[PDB]
Amino acid sequence: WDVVAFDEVAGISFKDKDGVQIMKDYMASGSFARGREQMEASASMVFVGNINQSVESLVKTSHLLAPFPEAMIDSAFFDRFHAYIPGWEIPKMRPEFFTNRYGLIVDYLAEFFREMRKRSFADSIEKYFKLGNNLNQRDVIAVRKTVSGLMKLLYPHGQFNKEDVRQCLEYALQVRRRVKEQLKKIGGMEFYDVHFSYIDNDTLEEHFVSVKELIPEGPAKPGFLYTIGLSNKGMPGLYRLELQVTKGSGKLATSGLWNSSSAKEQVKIAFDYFKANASRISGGSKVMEHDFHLHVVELQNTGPLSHLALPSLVAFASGLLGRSVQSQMVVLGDMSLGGSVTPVESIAECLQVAFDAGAKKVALPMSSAADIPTIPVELFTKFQTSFYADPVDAVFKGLG
Amino acid sequence: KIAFDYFKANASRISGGSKVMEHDFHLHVVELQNTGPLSHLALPSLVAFASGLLGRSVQSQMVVLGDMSLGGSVTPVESIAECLQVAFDAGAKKVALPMSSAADIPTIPVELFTKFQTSFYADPVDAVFKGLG
């Protein structure tokens, strides 16, 4: 058969305990070794599942592949999916959704697909684009297969424009990034590079594609915070910093910085400040015995930010102390290596971004005091101003 | 009495079901620095009734300043700076302020103002919501 589709995958059960790695190998290489001989197959595997809960509930409480059986909840096994079709956005079948017009023959369709199986169009993306730096080689393979398949359905004649490959590439990136988020959720740290992007070959613009899916009510895990900053295009934007701390030797890793030099130098200055002022801030905890990895995730698609030293230092202090930053916290402003604070750009705009439903308390720097009158009274009264003076006081206000 | 009347009037907007008519309140004023009688006490009284009726503990080491009218109009804090040094000497960590006292922020020394976590309530109901945390 050309396609095998496991219906109601929640009910799949295999008598042979060795089968799981057999499927792992079959999806990994297209061939499986049984006994002493290796058999190849061209059958495509589909997994059909029923979703019982709401999308938001499943996203917040679990991973979207929750209906999969416990025995099949594995990182490597889920890594082999070429796509995830989120059927919840597809409406339930209605007769008005059923056409009454002309259409090609189903047998004829299956035919044309079967002969199209012999051909390939995964190289078309190479003509107009390059893939971003946040996708591994498995991601490369998956996106190439998906774009080739969409090209096979829509453009069998081989004549195509750049807009077509844009649409196919972005669709593939979105469907694979959904899987990337699911694997990150189920596996913890190993799937952190989830920020899918593609660089245009001519314009050098890196377009970031995010899936369709400021603060949750409740105190977050230490090492997590939110900030608002003025991006390279000048619009205020919200970003989330996520710090992972492990027992190490003072090493620093960064991700989600849009591969921006400015963000890297700012966080490096912040790391230097934290190491220099570790004793007073941590009360004795040694930075030299812990490795920190900071991640930036952008929720508003506003663009990369340059000013990131102060929130990164706050995340460092929170993670090293293991005590949660205050709930609904928004950290504003930047800092110098000498501890001098810079006034927050776009006070009104930043507070408006913070006004987005959920956030209540904001730490403002002292230099922004002269900018208080520029704030409308109604907006200013809705927020608790944890007015700090220096980055040490900023950290203390952020941790309460 | 004005604070109690306002508390009766706005029970729904503050408590969400806790009925004033079914409960009796006893308010007791304690002087700790021998400073003398005070006049402006309506807004702190309202905060007290709201906290007691709801059983919600007030935020630790916060100081509520300002007074209110019967209709809910808030009055600016007279001599906010001296009250701030008093709070700093008293061990206070948070301050509750109305909008009108924000115009008095520039007259406040920056060092003292940096020591308190202001919430900047606007409405007396908003004053309750800020106080309850």
Author numbering:
A (entry chain I): 273 to 485, 491 to 677
B (entry chain G): 545 to 677
Authors' own words:
Bacteriophage exclusion (‘BREX’) systems are multi-protein complexes encoded by a variety of bacteria and archaea that restrict phage by an unknown mechanism. In this study we have demonstrated that the BrxL phage restriction factor is a multimeric DNA binding protein that displays ATP-dependent assembly on double stranded DNA.
EM grids of wild-type BrxL contained a mixture of particle sizes, with the majority appearing to comprise barrel-shaped multimers displaying seven-fold (heptameric) symmetry. The final CryoEM maps for the full size wild-type BrxL complex extended to approximately 3.5 Å resolution. Ultimately the maps supported modeling 14 independently placed BrxL subunits arranged into a dimer of heptameric rings. In the resulting structure, each heptameric ring assembles via contacts between the NTD and central ATPase domains of adjacent monomers. Two such heptamers further associate with one another via tail-to-tail contacts between their CTDs. A large internal void in the interior of the protein chamber contains no significant electron density. The buried surface area between adjacent protein subunits around each heptameric ring (as calculated using the PISA webserver) is approximately 1100 Å2 and involves up to six directional side chain hydrogen bonds and salt bridges distributed between eleven residues within each interface. The buried surface area between each pair of CTDs around the equator of the assemblage (producing the tail-to-tail dimerization of two heptameric rings) is smaller (∼600 Å2). The structural rearrangements observed when comparing unbound, DNA-free heptameric BrxLWT assemblages to DNA-bound BrxLE280Q hexameric assemblages involve (1) a hinged motion centered around a peptide linker (residues 469 to 497) connecting the AAA+ ATPase domain and the CTD, and (2) a pivot of the two CTD domains, relative to one another, in each ‘tail-to-tail’ subunit interface around the BrxL equator.
